Amino acid sequence: MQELYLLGVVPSRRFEAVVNSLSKTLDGPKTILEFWVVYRPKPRQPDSWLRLCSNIESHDETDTEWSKNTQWSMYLEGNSEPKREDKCGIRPVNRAKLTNGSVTEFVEKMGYEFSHEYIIQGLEYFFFDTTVRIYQTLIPSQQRSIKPPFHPMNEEQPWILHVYTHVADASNQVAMAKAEANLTKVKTLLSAFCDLKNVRL
Amino acid sequence: NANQMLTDILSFMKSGKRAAALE
């Protein structure tokens, strides 16, 4: 799967105004609250690390063992393509959703070990067949815990603006072109309040 | 500076590397 995207940063002081602008020009938003745990094979190559995502927006913070009562999406994110400066970014992204018992332990059995984990807090909008997410990456107050509070990595942490769309087949030239065209439309639509550009991933 | 934060935050999510700026 191919992910075409644009990235931008929104200072904490402008958050309110940018969100209202996004609500005035786009469809949405829907809240985003995800728990991510990353596993690496047991120069390191992170594009081969397993990135597990659980939607904690649908959990009881009181649930002592939420990780076993959840569905995890498993991702493999490659490095974005180079020489695409001044153009939208592109990177390979593969996904598979897995359940049954404790996925965490299953991936360790496959030969992987825990690397790091974090929480994503934000809003998600939609327009021109693309998704625009504005979020902050947080740190659990206790490893593998969904019980607040969650701490920012820095007190003057900006919000990240990530605009993207997915194309199933990289070979489909028409689909790829329609996606870049859609990103371009969203870019100018948000250019009045946020600079979006290709950033390496 | 917010652009430096972006780079460090993106790096952390990607490789778990925590820059000094991200305490």
Side-chain angles (χ1 to χ4, degrees), chain A residues 3 6 34 36 43 54 56 63 125 156 158 160 170 184 188 200:
Chain A
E3 177 177 300
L6 289 177
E34 312 167 327
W36 289 81
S54 167
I56 49 181
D63 189 324
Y125 292 83
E156 295 304 291
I160 294 178
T184 286
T188 111
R200 196 160 216 72

Side-chain angles (χ1 to χ4, degrees), chain A residues 23-36:
Chain A
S23 284
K24 169 180 163 291
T25 70
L26 308 178
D27 292 329
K30 85 178 180 188
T31 66
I32 292 296
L33 193 68
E34 312 167 327
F35 200 103
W36 289 81

Side-chain angles (χ1 to χ4, degrees), chain A residues 8-184:
Chain A
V9 83
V10 173
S12 191
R13 40 169 283 271
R14 292 185 54 226
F15 180 80
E16 192 183 24
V18 170
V19 170
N20 286 323
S21 290
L22 292 171
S23 284
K24 169 180 163 291
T25 70
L26 308 178
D27 292 329
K30 85 178 180 188
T31 66
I32 292 296
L33 193 68
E34 312 167 327
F35 200 103
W36 289 81
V37 319
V38 183
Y39 284 80
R40 63 183 182 180
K42 196 184 302 179
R44 79 299 167 54
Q45 303 296 56
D47 59 349
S48 70
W49 298 9
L50 260 17
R51 302 163 186 287
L52 282 21
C53 177
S54 167
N55 180 175
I56 49 181
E57 166 60 349
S58 66
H59 275 299
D60 303 3
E61 74 181 14
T62 55
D63 189 324
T64 60
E65 281 162 51
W66 59 278
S67 52
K68 275 197 169 185
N69 284 58
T70 319
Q71 185 171 186
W72 292 86
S73 281
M74 195 162 67
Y75 294 81
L76 277 181
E77 312 181 328
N79 302 151
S80 51
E81 299 171 4
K83 284 70 172 300
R84 279 194 66 78
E85 201 60 294
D86 290 355
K87 215 155 173 55
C88 80
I90 301 182
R91 64 170 182 164
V93 170
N94 296 295
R95 168 182 55 205
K97 301 180 177 179
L98 73 184
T99 46
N100 275 49
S102 178
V103 175
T104 278
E105 300 171 358
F106 184 88
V107 313
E108 299 182 313
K109 262 71 169 186
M110 290 188 270
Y112 293 78
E113 61 182 6
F114 176 71
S115 174
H116 56 292
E117 63 176 31
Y118 52 94
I119 287 174
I120 295 305
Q121 169 201 225
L123 289 170
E124 211 169 65
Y125 292 83
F126 324 79
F127 218 60
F128 288 125
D129 258 70
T130 73
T131 296
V132 25
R133 171 186 290 209
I134 183 167
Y135 69 97
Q136 208 159 65
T137 106
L138 279 11
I139 303 301
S141 46
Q142 215 79 301
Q143 182 162 296
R144 209 55 48 77
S145 175
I146 57 177
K147 298 192 304 303
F150 302 145
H151 307 109
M153 306 184 74
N154 187 296
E155 297 172 0
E156 295 304 291
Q157 195 173 305
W159 287 79
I160 294 178
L161 240 194
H162 184 183
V163 185
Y164 63 95
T165 187
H166 294 298
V167 177
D169 181 8
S171 176
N172 192 335
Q173 279 98 182
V174 174
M176 291 298 275
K178 180 65 63 183
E180 306 196 32
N182 281 325
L183 282 182
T184 286

